[PDB]
Every structure is written in structure tokens, then in C-alpha cells.
């Protein structure tokens, strides 16, 4: 009887860049909510980040959160303190260009100041069924894209 909210995320793509989707599970008070959507053209990195974003943006009461994901990207960012680094430098790289996926990283940062988050980095679906599920959810959405990922820049 209650600690957190547990969040499970995955996002993936069929060809990168290519159609992608995300899958998230949120377990509130004895209830569990799923989220899923597919995008016409985006990236892997963006799908993994978006999954975390959508789940967290879904909470409307300050929570104690445990977020379990296998994304290398989120992991990198969080562990290497991207956000902290960027925020001090106005979200631009050393050569004054906007950091890559600044739209998503900001949305993430904004969620993090709301909740007390405890990250759980998983490796392999083996003994992680909620993560297995998000992947199934993620790959399914990617197959029937209904959205356009606007912040998806072609270029660099």
C-alpha cells in the first residue's frame, strides 16, 4: 500500500528514420493505464523520450515516481546530466546551435521538477513483462501512424 506510481516505457521505429511508436504503462491506485501512438516519420531516440514524456505529463498530482525503461538515450542524458548542462547554457551547444531534440528534453525537464523520480534501467525483456508489453505496444502503433512528429528535423 502505496509508495509511488510505477511507469514503464518503450519507444521504437521501423527503420530510423521511419515510422515509430511508443508504449507506456502507468500504475496508479490499483489501476493501470496504457498510452500508445505511432508517428509517420521520427527517430528511435525521439520515440524513447516521448514515451517517458507522455506518461509523466499524464500525472496531475505531485508524485513519487519509479520509471523503468531500457532506452540508452534517456539513460545517457540522465546519467551524464545533459539537462543540467544545457539549462545553464540556454539549451545551445558550444557552437551556439540548439541542442538536438531540445523540444522533448525541455518537456522532460519540466516534468522532472514536478515529481520525485527514481529511474530504473532495465536490460532485456527477461523478467520484465511490463517492458516487454510497451515494446509490443510500441511496435504495433508504429505500424498505424496517425501523428506527425513536428519537432522532427530532417537535416542534422
Catalytic residue ranges: 10-11, 48, 70, 125, 135
Q: Whole-angstrom Cα distance, residue 4 to residue 118?
A: 10
Was 130 annotated as part of a binding site? Answer: no
* 135 labeled part of a ligand binding site: yes
The three-state (H, E, C) secondary structure of 11-56, written as one string:
EEECCCCEEEEEEEEEECCCCEEEEEEEEEEECHHHHHHHHHHHHH
Question: What is the helix (H) or strand (E) element at residue 117, kind and residue range?
Answer: strand 116-121
Hey, is 6 helix, strand or coil?
A: strand
70 is in an annotated binding site: yes
What residue numbers does the annotated binding site cover?
10, 48, 70, 135
What residue numbers does the annotated binding site for Mg(2+) cover?
10, 48, 70, 135
Amino acid at each position: 500500500m502505496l509508495k509511488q506510481v510505477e511507469i514503464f516505457t518503450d519507444g521504437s521505429c521501423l527503420g530510423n528514420p521511419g515510422p515509430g511508436g511508443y508504449g507506456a504503462i502507468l500504475r496508479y491506485r490499483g489501476r493501470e493505464k496504457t498510452f500508445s501512438a505511432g508517428y509517420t516519420r521520427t527517430t528511435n531516440n525521439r520515440m524513447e523520450l516521448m514515451a517517458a514524456i507522455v506518461a509523466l505529463e499524464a500525472l496531475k498530482e505531485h508524485c513519487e515516481v519509479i520509471l523503468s525503461t531500457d532506452s540508452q538515450y534517456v539513460r545517457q542524458g540522465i546519467t551524464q546530466g545533459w539537462i543540467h548542462n544545457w539549462k545553464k547554457r540556454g539549451w545551445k551547444t558550444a557552437d551556439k546551435k540548439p541542442v538536438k531534440n531540445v523540444d522533448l528534453w525541455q518537456r522532460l525537464d519540466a516534468a522532472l521538477g514536478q515529481h520525485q523520480i527514481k529511474w530504473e534501467w532495465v536490460k532485456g525483456h527477461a523478467g520484465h513483462p511490463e517492458n516487454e508489453r510497451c515494446d509490443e505496444l510500441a511496435r504495433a502503433a508504429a505500424m498505424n501512424p496517425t501523428l506527425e512528429d513536428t519537432g522532427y528535423q530532417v537535416e542534422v
